[PDB]
Design a protein around this ligand. Structure first.
Ligand SMILES: O=S1(=O)NCc2ccc(Nc3nccc(N(CCO)c4cccc5[nH]ncc45)n3)cc21
Length: 263
C-alpha cells in the first residue's frame, strides 16, 4: 500500500476504459522520483475485484519484460500504480509508425516470448495476450501488461477452467472446453505476432467470433502479413497448432525467436 502524499498526478488523462481512467504521475521512492501510470477507478464490486486480482498477480511477478507494479493507493479513489512504459500499447504505436523494421518487430516479440516463458515457469496464465496488452518502454523494449484475466495455476493443475471473451486470440481448447493453459497463451502469442507484423491491424477483420472458430476448425489460418519474414509466419503457424498436446510451449517459442533474431 502506497502513501497518497508521495504520489503526484498529472491533470491530463492518458486513456479511459470500463474500469475508469488512467493518469500519468510520479511517486517518490526513497530518494528518486519515478514516473508512473495509474488506473483510477471511476466513481462497483467487479472493478475493485478486477484491480485486486491484477494487483494480487503482479505482486508475485518479477521480470524485465513484464510491467512492474509499484503498489496500491487508497485515497480519493482506488489506485493501481505501475511503472510507466512511456510509449504505450504496441498496436497503437505500430499503427502510427510503419517504418519500424522487421528486425525491430522481431526483437520486441522475442522480448514478449521471454516474459511469457517466465510466466509459464511461474505457472501463471495471462489469458489476454494481445498486441494491445504489450507496452513499449522504448522502441526496443517491450513489456507485457494487463493481467486482469490472469490466473495463478494451482500446484496440482496444468490449466484453469473458466466475462471479457477476446475470442480472436483464443485457442480452440479455450472456446470448446473452457481450458486455459500456457499452451493457450502460446496460441494468443501467435495472434500477437501476426498483429505486430501487420503493424497493429486487427486480426480476422470483418469476422464474428463464431466465424473465426469455423475458419480454424476448417484448418484455415490468417495469411502472412506484407513483408513478414517467412520464418516468423511459420512460427505463427506453429503457435496455431490445433491440438494443444502438440502445440509448443514458450520455451520452444522463445528459443526459435532467439535463433532467428541472433543469426
Ligand atoms: O493506453 S494508455 O492508457 N494511453 C496512452 C498510454 C501511454 C503509456 C502507457 N503506459 C503504461 N505503462 C504502464 C502501465 C500502464 N497502465 C495503463 C494502461 O492500461 C496500467 C496501469 C495500472 C495497471 C496496469 N496493468 N497493465 C497496464 C496498467 N500504462 C499507457 C497508455
Amino acid at each position: 500500500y502506497l502513501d497518497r502524499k508521495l504520489l503526484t498526478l498529472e491533470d491530463k488523462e492518458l486513456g479511459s476504459g470500463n474500469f475508469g481512467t488512467v493518469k500519468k504521475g510520479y511517486y517518490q521512492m526513497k530518494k528518486v522520483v519515478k514516473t508512473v501510470a495509474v488506473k483510477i477507478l471511476k466513481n462497483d464490486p467487479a472493478l475493485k475485484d478486477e484491480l485486486l486480482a491484477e494487483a494480487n498477480v503482479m505482486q508475485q511477478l518479477d521480470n524485465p519484460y513484464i510491467v512492474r507494479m509499484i503498489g496500491i493507493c487508497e485515497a480519493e479513489s482506488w489506485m493501481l500504480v505501475m511503472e510507466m512504459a512511456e510509449l504505450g500499447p504496441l498496436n497503437k504505436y505500430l499503427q502510427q509508425n510503419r517504418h519500424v523494421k522487421d528486425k525491430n518487430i522481431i526483437e520486441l516479440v522475442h522480448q514478449v516470448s521471454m516474459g511469457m516463458k517466465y510466466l509459464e515457469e511461474s505457472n501463471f496464465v495471462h489469458r489476454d495476450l494481445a498486441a494491445r496488452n504489450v507496452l513499449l518502454v522504448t522502441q526496443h523494449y517491450a513489456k507485457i501488461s494487463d493481467f486482469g484475466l490472469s490466473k495463478a495455476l494451482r500446484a496440482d493443475e496444468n490449466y484453469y477452467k473458466a466475462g471479457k471473451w477476446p475470442v480472436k486470440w483464443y485457442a480452440p481448447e479455450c472456446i470448446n472446453y473452457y481450458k486455459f493453459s500456457s499452451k493457450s497463451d502460446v496460441w494468443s502469442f501467435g495472434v500477437l505476432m501476426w498483429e505486430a507484423f501487420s503493424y497493429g491491424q486487427k486480426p480476422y477483420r470483418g469476422m464474428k467470433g463464431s466465424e473465426v472458430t469455423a475458419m480454424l476448425e476448417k484448418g484455415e489460418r490468417m495469411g502472412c502479413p506484407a513483408g513478414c519474414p517467412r520464418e516468423m509466419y511459420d512460427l505463427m503457424n506453429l503457435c496455431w497448432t490445433y491440438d494443444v498436446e502438440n502445440r509448443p510451449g514458450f520455451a520452444a517459442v522463445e528459443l526459435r525467436l532467439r535463433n532467428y533474431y541472433y543469426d
